[PDB]
Each structure stands twice: as C-alpha cells, then as structure tokens.
Design a protein around this nucleic acid. Structure first.
Lengths: 147, 104, 125, 56, 52, 52, 187
RNA sequence: GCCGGCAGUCGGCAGAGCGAGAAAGAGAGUGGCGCGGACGCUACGCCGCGACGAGUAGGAGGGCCGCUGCGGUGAGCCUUG
RNA sequence: UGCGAGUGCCUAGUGGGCCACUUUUGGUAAGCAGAACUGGCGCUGCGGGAUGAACCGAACGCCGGGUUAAGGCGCCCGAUG
RNA sequence: AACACGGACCAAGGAGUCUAACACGUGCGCGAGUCGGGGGCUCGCACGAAAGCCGCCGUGGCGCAAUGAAGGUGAAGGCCGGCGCGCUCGCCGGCCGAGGUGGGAUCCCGAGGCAGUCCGCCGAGGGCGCACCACCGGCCCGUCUCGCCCGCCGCGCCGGGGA
RNA sequence: AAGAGGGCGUGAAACCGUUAAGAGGUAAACGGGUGGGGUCCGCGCAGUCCGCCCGGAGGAUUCAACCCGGCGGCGCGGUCC
C-alpha cells in the first residue's frame, strides 16, 4: 500500500524529510560496514563487543550430524507418553513403572530441570545427567541406556 | 449455488448470469465473500447442507474430514448487549445517572 | 443478534450513501432513513415501517413478526391504513404504544405517516 | 481568611486562580525602573490601592 | 454447540418437504469482517499476472 | 521488475477462519440485504433443496 | 503570551482499541458503560486493559494461574484475565477453577473442564459480577518476551548483561576483542 | 484535559429526579370520565466545562482533498446528450 | 511557595553559527580573532527606534469594544489646538 | 530584495520506487508449540496459472537450555524421625513442594451507620498479595583457592561430590 | 453536423487580430477596507406558513359503542398441553 507510505505526506516539502543543511547524499559514512576500526569504532564498541579478532581452534570439516544431541527435561517428561499411561500408575498394587523411550520420540540426552511427580519410571535414553538420575532415583525409578 | 456431486448442475446454472458453482469440498473465500464483504445469498442442496457438519463439525466434535481442526472459540456469547445492560442484576449495581445538562 | 450485525452493516452496506457531508440509508422499513443503530429496518427483531399504498391513497404499515426469523417471505406483514387523516395517525399510534412494540419509533412513525398524506393530495394551486 | 492571614491560608490562595487583571487605565509611570526613581516596579507598599482600581 | 434451529428442505416448486435438517454449527461461527477483509485482500493477489 | 512480491500467503487456519465467518454470514438476513440481494420473497434464507 | 511547555500537553494514553474487530469492541462497549457508571475501580482496569496491544497483554500460563490461585483467602474465587489462557505442560494436577478470559487455547480448555472447572467469558462476567466483587485480576509476565532482553544498558559496557544483536551464535562471531581479557579488553 | 456526561426513550406492565457543602437507599417487610407525553444514540455517535493556539530542519495524526486501474456495491447516470 | 509523577522502546534532523548587558585573552584598534553566564536572531511575525538580524516593549488561531507597554502628540502622521 | 546563483512565457513528461536482510511498534490466527516452504492428490484450468486437502502435518526453519577454545557438562532445595561424634558431614522413609524482604493496581474480612430479619451501599483497621522495580538469597556452565569423602567389571596420571 | 472542407474526432494556455466597457505622468502587479460602474442571478416587486380553538356560511352515505371473519403483539396461564 503506497498510499499509506510516508512519501505521500512529503509531497510539497522541498527537502522531502531528509534535512536542509546536510542533504541526503549518496554514501556519507561509506558503503556497508565501512570502517570497523576507523570513524565507526564507537558504534562497534558500545553495541557489538567482541566483533574483531580470532578466538579458539579451527575445525575444518565440521558436520552437524555428529554433534546432534537434543535435550528434554524432567518437567516435560510425561507429555512424551499419552495421558492414560500415567493415570494407570500408582495403582493395581504392582508399581507398574511404565517405560518412556526418549530415543523413540527423537531426543537423546535427558536433563534434570523441573520437578518430577512421585511415580517410578523407566527411561530409555542415550545420555543422562547427574542431576537427572538423583531426581528419578529419589522418586524411585531407574534409568536404562540404549544405543 | 453450492453443489456436492457433479451430475449436470454445473451444466444447468451456467449461462444464467451471476450464479457461481462451488463444490462443498472446494469452497472458495473469493466467491463466498466478493469484495471483502461477508454478505452473500447462497443456494444449498440436501447433500451439500448435511456435509457442513462433516467438514468442520461442532465445537464438541472434530472436523472428521480435515486432520486437525475445530471451530474457533467465541470471544463473547451474549452478543446482544441491549439485554445485558437491561438485565436487572446489572441495573441493581448501577448508580443514579446524571442527565441534567450543565451549561456555562 | 442485533448489536453484533450492526457493527458490520454500519459502514459497508449497499444502502449506505454519504454523498457530500451527510449519511443516509435507503433500505426498506427504515423511517427517517438515517444510518443509525436505532433507525434500521433489518437488524432489529421488531421493525416499524411506513410506506405509501400501492394505489396512491393510504398508507400500508409493515410489522415484523418476531415469531420466525430467517424467513423473509413470512417475516413481514403489511396492513393498509386509509382513514380520514386523523384516525390514520391514531391507528398507527395504537399499533406501537398499546402493543408495547419497540416504542422508541412511536412518534417518528407518526411523523412519516403525516408527510405521506400530503403527497397523496392536490399540491399546487 | 485572605485579609486576616489565618492558619488555613495556604489552600485559600491555592483555590483562587491567579487574577486576570486588565491593562492599567490611565497608563503607568515607567515599567522598566523601580518605584523609587519614578517607575512602577518594585514595592508599592501603600500606593498599590491606587493601581488596583486601574487594573480592575 | 449453541441453540441450533431446524432448517427444512424445499421442493422444486416451493412446498417445503417433510425432510428437515438441523442447522450446522458452521452458521453459528463468530463473524469477524476484518479477517474476512484481510483474507480477501491477500488471496486475491495470488491470481495476479506479473507486469514489467 | 518481474520479481515483485505478487503473491501473498495466508495461514491455513486464517484462511479457514474467514470461510467459517463467510458461511455464518450467509444466514442473518440483515447481512444479505445489506449486500443488496433481493430476498423479500424467499421462504427461508438457508435454502436447502433435494438432490434431484 | 503564556510560558507553558506544550510538549507534554497531550497525554499519550490510549482511548480506543486499534483492532477493527467487532467482538472486542462490543466488549469495550459493554465495559465502557460500566466504567463511567459503576463506582467499582475494577471495571476501569479491565477497560484500560482492553485497549492494550497484543505484545502488551502477555499470555498467562496455566501453572502460574494455579500458583497464584492456591494462595490462602481465595477459595471459591474466580480469576479474571485480560490476555489469553495457555496450557502448561509441566503441571500435572489441576484443581477446580473459575476463569474468565477473552480466549482460551483448546488444550488448556479441555484440561479445565475435565477437572470440573468453569470457563466464562467477559459478557457472562458482567451478568455474574457487574461490580467485579469476589474477583481476582491477574496478568502474564510483561517482561517475559525475548524482546526485552535486548533492552536496558547497551552491550560492551561494564556490568551490563544485555543480549547483543547477533545473526547466529558461534565461537568466532563474538567473544573476541571487547569481550576477552586476552584480546584487548573486557567489560 | 476533565477517573467528563449520555445504554434512563426504565410510559395505565407509567409516575417522568440524583447541581447537590458534608462516607452510604426517593430499599422490602414484621409486632405494639378523556389512551396521551417535542429532539436523540452514524456510542469511530451526541452533548457539557476549563485551559491553550507562532514556527525553520524534523516527526506524528486527519483528509466526505485529488489521479489511475481492480473486487464488490448504487434495479447508478448516459444520443431527449 | 507552586506543580498530577515515574518509567521503557524506536527515532528524523543537527554536529559551519552569529549578536548583545556583564567578566575577560591576543591585538593600537576593528562590523577582528578566541573564552564564561544569560537572553535573543537563526526558527519570529507585531508596535516603536525615519530606514533595519541581534536595540526597547511584546511573542501571533479569525473578529468587535475598552485599556496600555516602549515610544511619542507643529505638518507629513493618530494624538498637548 | 540583493551589485550571490537559476528563472522570456505556456502545454505535456519529471524525481524517496522494488527485492533481500533485519530491529522496533501495531493488527490477526494458533499457541510450547507454530508454519506449510517444496512436492503430491481433486476437473476438464472460463473466472483457475485461483481454491481445497495431505500416517508427505513436520523432512525442515524458529522457539522450548545454556555455558565452555575444546574434550564436555548442563539449570532446587527445605522440613520432620532414625543409623555414626550434633561431624552443620555420609546413609535410610514421609511432608512442603519453586524462596524471602520492601513498594505494589485490584479483591476479602470488616468495628458502625446509612423491638427487629434480609437485599445493597459506605466504612476506621487488618490481609493474601496481579503485573512490574530494587535488594538479598538459591541453581547451571567456564575459571581460581582450600581439602576431605564416596564407587567400581577394568583400583587408575579413574570418575563424582563440598565450601 | 464543414461551428467535421483532404495534416479535416474536441480544440486548452503562452501569443496575436478585431468588437463592447473602463482606466491611464511616480514601471506593472498585490493584501486589508470601502465606493462607483457593468454582465447575469433571486423568473422577487403588496410578500412565509404550520397545528389547536371560536363564528356563520356548504357537502358526505360518515363518529362513538356493538356483530362476524382475518392478522399481529403480550402471557409471572403465579406452576395450560
């Protein structure tokens, strides 16, 4: 919608909304990120710290498939399975302890963020955290690895 | 005219000007509301009219022909506010009005 | 309902006509023809209309039924008023006040029926 | 409460809007200088009552 | 589902037949003309041939 | 240029939102007359006919 | 002439909602009348909050509502929210509730009704409590947006924890001269 | 700018007010002839007070200011122009 | 003593200034160059100083009546004829 | 106004557009999910090179987890009772279950009054306290210092834990 | 229809010719305020009606109240089917 643009209200004004003393020239400061160290140094220092220089080692042929490790916390753990699984727990005088396969849904490492409701479980994951175990072991469950 | 099965109804309402044929499964917003205005006089058949609750359903049922859809929730139910403002339980809580005009 | 459909018709109706600093609405059953929430012949459940008779002598008065909507063939009922121009206004006055039929258009309907009767008479000497 | 400055005087002056006095009828002596050297600025300790009737 | 009336089926010469259909819940959906206006003024741009 | 943004894509839920409001506005005859259609003689606005 | 600074003469509060929808304006129409007639200041806050923008009335999570409604004193009490009610997946048990909001998500709606709760709309709220007596007014986290983490003191400033504007998070795009003691300086 | 006012046009289903110095109701109970009443309220509307009104670069808002074409709409106009 | 206050986002334009009471540097001096506070022109029309950047008064929506500031009241030119 | 520049006049044309990347604000839909990109399926395409649909409905992008150069690690504790030294430490079972302080729009109780009951309304005082601000705490990762404890399929230049 | 006459659908402005009116020694032109003179407009030139009541002059196949038929509204019919 060009009829709602600022250009329609600027018809008549000589400078067209861009100053009378300093006219809108082609490129006053320079094209692109011109002068990272010179004449634009203050903007790069107090808004983009750490822009200049090298750090760390270089890994040449880096593949994202090796470093794939999606995480899931204990607070969002019963959403991995259906609602009728957890209501059929703490019942039947057995300690059913349903098995939640983390790798089956598409997560690898299990983290310990959140509060786990009091129901022993069996969790199947490729990786685990130290704080993840003591919440499940504190509840009364057990962790089982898989490859 | 909204038709459900193609059996010659397109062949009939074809030369008479203004009538656009819409399939039930292929309804179009550009013809159900021309010009951005919601008013449109519609003609339905028996098969077309019974498929509307099989295309979208009610609020307590799924679409049953689209995968994941249900009717959107109403922001407000009692749209007629002339009865809400005239309800005795609201008029009880209102104060006396000030309708005397107070000029300079 | 009534307030819900008023906000849609108020600006994009086919009867809407602005035309150099006024606003009017030319739908049937709208006495005083204002594009207003009160003066609207379609959005209401109860509708009062005054319109001159087909033969050019009298006023046919149109009432909404309130018993069945979405049936415009049987939604409106027309009664013809042709009296001595004083009971003509008194009959329409009794259709509103005595029936408790949407009474804010009591006097405005009498105003419209009053001007129609000077249309159906000799006008210029 | 105005004339005799009592112990509720602060909100009395706050209630009154600052007075929109008209221009002095008859003219002023001199606006720029103090009242001592024939001007009208400064402390009009007694002769303000002459000027008030010209404002109002 | 709100209060839904019963809609009759008319024959080819008027004369509403005995077959009556309950009004579908689609007709009780909220009316929001701006969304209808927003959808109409954007879907209509899809059948536009380029000019240059 | 030929590569101006001619087409606009709208979310499927929003596209399905306006059609629910368009069908629900086919009832409420105050809406239909406000479009301009002559409905005064129609026996019932949700006109349902047979499969013949 | 009068020496008055006219730059703050016009207050910048909202008067009319910027939305062109008709259901919100009917709710505004309902609560416009209750604000200037009733002596209840609850209706003025609701009318003030019915004018806000979408980023101004943040969504209220279901578990925060449970946390804020389990406080002592508010039993048999309704909760009125101006934003939207959204489900929280990390809460297991939900008690009986009475919630009023413009919009409730479908996953959160079925959870409240399953536990014997009651979801009301703002038009039914006026019929129940026109003065808002016995109501609890809550709201979502105003600062919970990702936008506010870029605000405040600028980055590259000592004792400032503002997230910089970076196209993608990597080792060599940032954390260099200006951030490291080994590379020039740090703040 | 006013915590501005107006949903109260609550009419033989009626009693027409809440400008008035003072925190709250023209509230329910229980014992001792003549058919009558001007306007209105596009609540994105109507109405009432108080203050103010300069302006370059610049910013914002309203245009029922204007041109071209498109979807609707005016049972629109037009060789009697 | 007077005034409703606090707070968060983007953001144009500007980055050649000049003059004046007072203080004051270099220079014999300058409508010269360079500093401090405050006010103006820039951006500002109006009455007056005959004329006019910055001087005095005074700041501006369109009008009627009345009254003034600074200036003035032999004629031009309103007013001491 | 200039002894600064352009302008003899008139008619037509004539200059802040588009794409992409973004940041903020605003409107809508869904919502810890969101999206259909691309592809495929309906009817031959008038309108239609439009529309509708998808165990492709999530492959994937973004977000829900960050911190490290990296090997890697990864977001909660408190109360009560017992077992060893009250050793503020290790081991066993229940409870609260996501901190506290101050300011906090609203809402609740509310002394009293507008013989005697109910509907409201106001109300000194007392509160759980939305959002948000400040502070003190608590937790995760990198790093520094002080030390002890625990475990084993491989007792080690092992791994984990504390302040 | 040449008031469409071979570069001929209409034929603007700059510019020029002619006619009517007016004016003319401080270049012309402009703003505020009037006055005068014109071309047309108000188809003006015995000056607007609208309701109630009173008086006398005239006319209907007529008023109130009843009977039948049809239509409509309401019904806390305290709680019809």
């Amino acid at each position: 919608p060009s009829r709602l643009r600022k250009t329609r209200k600027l018809r008549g004004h000589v400078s067209h909304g861009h100053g009378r003393i300093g006219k809108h020239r082609k490129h006053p400061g320079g094209r692109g990120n011109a002068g990272g160290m010179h004449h634009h140094r203050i903007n790069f220092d107090k808004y983009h710290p750490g822009y200049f220089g090298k750090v760390g080692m270089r890994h040449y042929h880096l593949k994202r498939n090796q470093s794939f490790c999606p995480t899931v916390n204990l607070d969002k753990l019963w959403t991995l399975v259906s609602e009728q699984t957890r209501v059929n727990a703490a019942k039947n005088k057995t300690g059913a302890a349903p098995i939640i396969d983390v790798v089956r849904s598409g997560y690898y490492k299990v983290l310990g963020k959140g509060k786990l409701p009091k129901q022993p479980v069996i969790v199947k994951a490729k990786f685990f955290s130290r704080r993840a175990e003591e919440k499940i072991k504190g509840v009364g469950g057990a962790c089982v690895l898989v490859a | 005219v909204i038709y459900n099965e193609d059996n010659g109804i397109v062949k009939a309402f074809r030369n008479i000007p203004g009538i656009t044929l819409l399939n039930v499964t292929k309804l179009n917003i550009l013809k159900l509301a021309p010009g951005g205005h919601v008013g449109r006089f519609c003609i339905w058949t028996e098969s077309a009219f019974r498929k509307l609750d099989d295309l979208y359903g009610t609020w307590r049922k799924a679409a049953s022909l689209k995968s994941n859809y249900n009717l959107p929730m109403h922001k407000m139910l009692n749209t007629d506010l002339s009865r809400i403002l005239k309800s005795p339980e609201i008029q009880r809580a209102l104060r006396a009005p000030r309708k005397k005009i107070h000029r300079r | 309902s009534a307030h819900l459909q008023w906000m849609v018709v108020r600006n994009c109706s086919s009867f809407l006509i602005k035309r150099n600093k006024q606003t009017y609405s030319t739908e049937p059953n709208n006495l005083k023809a204002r594009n207003s929430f009160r003066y609207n012949g379609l959005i209401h459940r109860k509708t009062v209309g005054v319109e001159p008779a087909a033969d050019g002598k009298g006023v046919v008065v149109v009432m909404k039924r309130r018993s069945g909507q979405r049936k415009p063939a049987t939604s409106y009922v027309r009664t013809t008023i042709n009296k001595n121009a004083r009971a003509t206004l008194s009959s329409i006055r009794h259709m509103i006040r005595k029936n408790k039929y949407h009474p804010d258009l009591r006097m405005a309907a009498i105003r419209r029926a009053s001007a129609i009767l000077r249309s159906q008479k000799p006008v210029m000497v | 409460e105005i004339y005799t400055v009592g112990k509720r005087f602060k909100e009395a002056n706050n209630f009154l809007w600052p007075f929109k006095l008209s221009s002095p009828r008859g003219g002023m002596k001199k606006k720029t200088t103090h009242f001592v050297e024939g001007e009208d600025a400064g402390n009009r300790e007694d002769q303000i009552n002459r000027l008030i009737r010209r404002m109002n | 589902a709100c209060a839904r009336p019963l809609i009759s089926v008319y024959s080819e010469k008027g004369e509403s037949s005995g077959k009556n259909v309950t009004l579908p819940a689609v007709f009780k959906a909220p009316i929001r003309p701006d969304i209808v206006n927003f959808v109409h003024t954007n879907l209509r741009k899809n059948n536009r041939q380029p000019y240059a | 240029k030929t590569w101006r943004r001619w087409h606009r894509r709208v979310n499927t839920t929003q596209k399905r939102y306006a059609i629910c409001s368009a069908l629900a506005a086919s009832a409420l005859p105050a809406l239909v007359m406000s479009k301009g259609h002559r409905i005064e003689e129609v026996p019932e606005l949700p006109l349902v006919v047979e499969d013949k | 002439g009068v020496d008055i600074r006219h730059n703050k003469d016009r207050k910048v509060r909202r008067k009319e909602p910027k939305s062109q929808d008709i259901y919100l304006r009917l709710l505004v129409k309902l609560y416009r009348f209750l604000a200037r007639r009733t002596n209840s200041t609850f209706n003025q806050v609701v009318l003030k909050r019915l004018f806000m923008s979408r980023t101004n009335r943040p969504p209220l999570s279901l578990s925060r509502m449970i946390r804020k409604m389990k406080l002592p004193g508010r039993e048999g009490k309704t909760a009125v929210v101006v934003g939207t009610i959204t489900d929280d997946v990390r809460v297991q048990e939900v008690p009986k509730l009475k919630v009023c909001a413009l919009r409730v998500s479908s996953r959160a709606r079925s959870r409240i009704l399953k536990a014997g709760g009651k979801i009301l709309t703002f038009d039914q709220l006026a019929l129940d409590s026109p003065k808002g007596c016995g109501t609890v007014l809550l709201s979502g986290p105003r600062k919970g947006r990702e936008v506010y983490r870029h605000f405040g003191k600028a980055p590259g400033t000592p004792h400032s924890h503002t997230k910089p504007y970076v196209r993608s998070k990597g080792r060599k795009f940032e954390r260099a001269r200006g951030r490291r003691a080994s590379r020039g300086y740090k703040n």
